[PDB]
Design a protein around this ligand. Structure first.
Ligand code: LLL
Ligand code: C8E
Ligand code: C8E
Ligand code: C8E
Ligand code: C8E
Ligand code: NA
Ligand code: NA
Ligand code: NA
Ligand code: NA
Ligand code: NA
Ligand code: NA
Ligand code: NA
Ligand code: NA
Ligand code: NA
Lengths: 350, 350, 350
């Protein structure tokens, strides 16, 4: 089977030992206390779980004899036993790609990677534990952006003048990746280092998204700043603007923000985070109680150059629900209800 | 994505080459002869299969610079192609955990591990081929015990005075691990070395088990002995007592036993095994024909220090069926009918 | 759980470092242009995808102290992100076996391997991109052959007199592997190297195949020739004859062929391929328009001893459909409709 059967194994010279095994060992013991309005649902969803986000990966680089740009590849496994999921992950569930790099024009990757917009949403703005609100939270229809996405081509520019970089990507959408749709998206992000500050801007457009009986277009915009000061204080702040248009003329808009404050001293880092989605507006009308927010606190100990220990507490306050354009409830990260979470964890890199 | 995204890869110093790849290569060619009472069911269930229980694992240890107890981790894949199943296993389907160890207080593991009770049920008492009766066999409702279980914290004591050790564990149940329940369980085992003998006792309690339209509590108790004699004879014997209470007032009790005899000489080991479940009692009344038993013989050849070859033959005689508390047939390991199995196998450890 | 619990890990001497990690990094960017007769279906199925056929494997050999023939084993992962599928593959989805080998009598493998017949169908006769027609295409009922198959024992002879080799195999069927049937199959292939030519012949019989409310018997025969000339010209040609007999007395026949021409000069290889399935005959009557064919062109660049780059174009013309013996449509590789495909790709072996 496959594009060339096992011919590579029969005719090519094996490049023995040209790989690296790597892994992130990551365990979070997390107790969730839900307040959904239903005592049984709270008992099911809440309680103590172990969130095992350990993963194994393989990666390598190769200088082909007949081609100047260096070939790069990566295959990274999924989380081996996350909370709320069964055990076991396949290889290739996380960033998994081939590509080429050259110091002059940067790096082009093909495969499964983070979109330029999602990368900024994810880090720094989803940490610590802000992601239920800022990453995959929100009430807007269609697809505000992809996150980790297969069938993508992504270009990461060089760091021009040691100060300015661009990431650009296009790819197939989720249904298109199964031969079940013709959705697609394109995106671009830019970063500018201004001394102790970094400026970020990003865009993503999704097209031909099928949902709630309509076809959707989404456009999402993001601006952010990150900074670190000499007294050990650092911060980030991000503003995010989401627009969606359905094929029946319905328009939706929602915006969001995320901010974080960190104090690093010695082997310790203290962190506070806040994120909110504001009320969704549909066809000029504000939908009441469609906002979300989360406040988070974290203390982290640099127990080793390769590892951290941390404790975290957060409070999620979600929207009360809304209907999509087909008169059914629209799923959001608030569907299961509000909760608080107390957790301790370890992360280790080999 | 995740509790801390890809921050570990970005900010931590990679602890290169600090891992081990290990594996058990295990293949059993097994012919089954079923006598279910339906000739077509016999043809489907029976016949020759290959039972590929090979698996790959990763593990390592790390002395963190700022923390005295040693960090340990393991990620083990599932069986790559077992009999009666499709091919392919993910990483993390078997014992997969992080933990800490210190010579004074032993070892604590968090993740997916064997329960204290199941570890004794599994070894030595399920071997060779006694498991259909003694491990997952039985007629009792609820969950008599978990076996390999995610969302567990397990403490293994040191071997005090070269004689006495304890294993204790608590964890979330199966539905709770999907956010769909609040089942939980706790267990404890103790081992006492009296020269050539070892004494074993174990307990497990499961709570809030949802099954057959009821909520269940289970309590399971186990006592056993194992012995090694230098004329080459070794043996084990176990008695197991299981009780279950449903929320509609039903009580069930069942007990079981397992015994094995071994003669080891040179590169050879002969083994006989026997296990039985006795009649289930429901509400003080014994249910007739709800018992099971199995007799097994095995010859094992130590073909290498790292590997064994073995041949095995066993006869399973199962219960004749019983209803659960929702007036439908209760699934047991006897549902598919009686069978004999003849097999040869290899196991190899790298 | 398992035939021997975790006893290997507790009692056997670990053969550390007796393993190899290997991989094929394989990425194909493929644009599909469908002409199915329905514009929506054309839009869903067609478009650009990445076909990531990268996979990771583990393999090794061990000379047992007490056994002459060398022990061999392999565990190979599946495709990490193929087109039309989700991401993630388990270990063991591809060739995964244990076995023994000796220079005198060849090699026996137990586990998941290609059948002798399928190996010739796959390479050379399905390349480049002829497989939709010649590999899993075709309209005949039952199972014309297995491809990669679990529960197999396969014997590969030595190359006698440097000229003649045999592969023979038997195994359980797909439902038998789940204990849901008693299908099985046997096959044999032979190869003869006569100067610049290689001659190939193969047979496979499948029995007790359940499909379309019937039980099927299949017999498939194959003859082929491959040639390599010193001026850089090479070719292959293969003929395939398939017969099937259903348990209600219906008989079916179909034949097929595949041919390819290659010109290799320096670091370049040009390739043209053609394959066709001819009209199916059912109970002596030809069913019109049940034939398929494909024409394909490829240019391949040997970018490295370990890697190739290639570009490829093909046009698939499929049958218009047919009913099975239960009066429902019989699925074939033409069910989704005709299409053209343009692609570029890379393959790399480490
Ligand atoms: C849980 N039963 C599994 C069965 O689902 C399958 O293994 C799946 C595997 O096929 C899935 O992968 C498959 O389905 C994915 C969506 N869930 C998309 C990718 C696809 N290859 C993995 N995500 C999980 C394994 N347990 O085959 C092995 C098994 C044990 O029988
Ligand atoms: C550049 O950095 C901007 C970060 O500031 C984010 C705060 O944005 C305020 C959004 O509130 C408007 C909601 O209607
Ligand atoms: C210290 C380990 C020695 C274990 C030896 C094996 C013991 C075999 O005992 C079997 C007893 O037979 C049980 C009959 O059923 C008992 C009914 O009472 C329990 C209620 O279910
Ligand atoms: C050996 O190589 C065989 C090549 O055969 C080419 C195709 O054979 C003709 C098939 O046509 C039969 C029509 O039913
Ligand atoms: C060394 C032998 C070289 C082989 C060349 C002979 C093969 C030529 O036969 C081609 C026959 O094709 C005729 C029609 O193909 C089948 C119908 O097409 C299906 C359209 O749906
Ligand atoms: Na719960
Ligand atoms: Na989990
Ligand atoms: Na997506
Ligand atoms: Na069978
Ligand atoms: Na199997
Ligand atoms: Na369980
Ligand atoms: Na499409
Ligand atoms: Na895919
Ligand atoms: Na098959």
């Amino acid at each position: 089977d496959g594009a060339n059967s096992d011919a590579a194994k029969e005719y090519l010279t094996k490049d023995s030992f040209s790989y690296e095994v790597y892994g992130i060992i990551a365990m979070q013991a997390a107790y969730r206390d839900y307040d959904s309005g239903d005592a049984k649902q709270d008992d099911n969803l809440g309680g103590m779980q172990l969130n095992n986000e350990s993963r194994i990966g393989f990666r390598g680089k190769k200088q082909f004899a007949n081609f100047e740009p260096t070939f790069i590849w990566q295959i990274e496994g999924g989380y081996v036993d996350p909370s709320f999921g069964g055990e076991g992950a396949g290889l290739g569930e996380r960033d998994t790609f081939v590509g080429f790099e050259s110091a002059s024009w940067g790096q082009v990757r093909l495969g499964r990677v983070l979109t330029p917009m999602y990368e900024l949403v994810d880090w720094p703005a989803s940490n610590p534990g802000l992601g239920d609100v800022y990453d995959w939270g929100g009430a807007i229809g269609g697809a505000k952006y992809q996150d980790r996405q297969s069938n993508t081509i992504r270009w990461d520019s060089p760091m021009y003048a040691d100060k300015f970089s661009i990431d650009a990507a296009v790819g197939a959408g989720d249904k298109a990746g199964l031969g079940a749709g013709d959705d697609y998206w394109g995106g671009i992000a830019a970063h500018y280092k201004l001394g102790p500050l970094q400026l970020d801007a990003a865009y993503e457009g999704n097209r031909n998204i099928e949902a709630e009986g309509q076809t959707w277009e989404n456009n999402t915009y993001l601006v952010g700043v990150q900074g670190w000061f000499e007294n050990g204080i650092s911060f980030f702040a991000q503003y995010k603007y989401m627009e969606a248009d359905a094929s029946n003329g319905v328009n939706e808009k929602q915006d969001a923000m995320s901010a974080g404050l960190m104090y690093t001293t010695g082997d310790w880092q203290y962190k506070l985070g806040y994120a909110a989605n504001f009320d969704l507006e549909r066809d000029g009308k504000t939908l009441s109680n469609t906002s979300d927010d989360v406040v988070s606190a974290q203390i982290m100990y640099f127990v080793d150059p390769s590892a951290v220990l941390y404790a975290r507490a957060r409070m999620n306050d979600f929207n009360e629900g809304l209907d999509g354009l087909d008169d059914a409830a629209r799923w959001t990260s608030g569907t299961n209800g509000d909760y608080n979470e107390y957790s301790v964890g370890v992360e280790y890199y080999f």
